A paper describes a structure:
WD40 proteins are a subfamily of propeller proteins with no intrinsic enzymatic activity, but their stable, modular architecture and versatile surface have allowed evolution to adapt them to many vital roles.
In one crystal form of Ika8 this axis is crystallographic, but in the other (and in the Ika4 crystals) it is noncrystallographic. In all crystal forms, the Ika proteins assemble as trimers which stack on top of each other into pillars. In comparison, only the alternating repeats of the Ika proteins can be superposed, in contrast to the template structure where the overlap of the individual blades is much poorer. The symmetry is also visible in the electrostatic potential map, where eightfold and fourfold symmetry can be observed for Tako8 and Ika8, respectively, with the exception of small differences owing to crystal-packing inter­actions; such charge symmetry is absent from the template protein.
Numbering used by the authors: 1 to 318
The structure:
Amino acid sequence: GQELVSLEGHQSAITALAFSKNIVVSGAADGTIKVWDILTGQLLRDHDGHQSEVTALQFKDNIVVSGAKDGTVKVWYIGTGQELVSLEGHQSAITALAFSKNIVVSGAADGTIKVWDILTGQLLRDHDGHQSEVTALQFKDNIVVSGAKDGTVKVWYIGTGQELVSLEGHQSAITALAFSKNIVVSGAADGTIKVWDILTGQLLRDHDGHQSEVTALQFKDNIVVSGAKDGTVKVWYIGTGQELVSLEGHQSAITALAFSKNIVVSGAADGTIKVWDILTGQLLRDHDGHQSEVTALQFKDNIVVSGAKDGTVKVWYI
């Protein structure tokens, strides 16, 4: 349970983080984007980003999709950092990104949602998504599910361009989403978690949650992991709302969550990173990760990658 590598990090707060293969892409509030090789810990690509704060990152098959505060959306190659396609982006700040096959879906602070083809650069769909800032976005199988700061959740089809079903949403800002072919599950800031039949729109379950002011959510299978400002990390079943295991949490506000296999990695505003086993509830690791708030966590193949508000990027083993 030590550090794999030292990484130089950035000169400003880490705002986005992506992890794939042995490559980590990190974005900072000064617009700089850096690419690192985990095996050697060397910075391969420097200054490939934007001129405003990086707000979202997507990394899939040697291609990085990055969004910035000025609304720009860039698609470039990790090998050379040269942009592949030119996207006009949004006029408002990018707030959410989804990347699947050749499609990029971007959400902005004005509520707009745009669908791009990263082979032609064409704007496939221009959407007046919500009357509020798009705070979450999930893309799967030709259908987009979005969440906004006003509590609204929406799903639509890319070709038709109209909504498939009307979901009532929440009454606080949405935090994280996920959905299957049959159901949608969404969670808001006040702890609410709701599941929706996509066809009819019916509310199959309405859970009030166990926390006040959640700051991070993570869905996988029917298990939700929720962190809150009070420092609690809770694991429970979305079908019934029953808590599964008890975790000590942190003495500081939860600011990042990662979830892989049966391992939960949580980061707090004091920089501490904790590693839990949801089968037993025991604390596997208790790292004094960073000296500032943990702003991003990536967890793949027993390797945790973390970023902090001081610009540091660390990578760990379990």
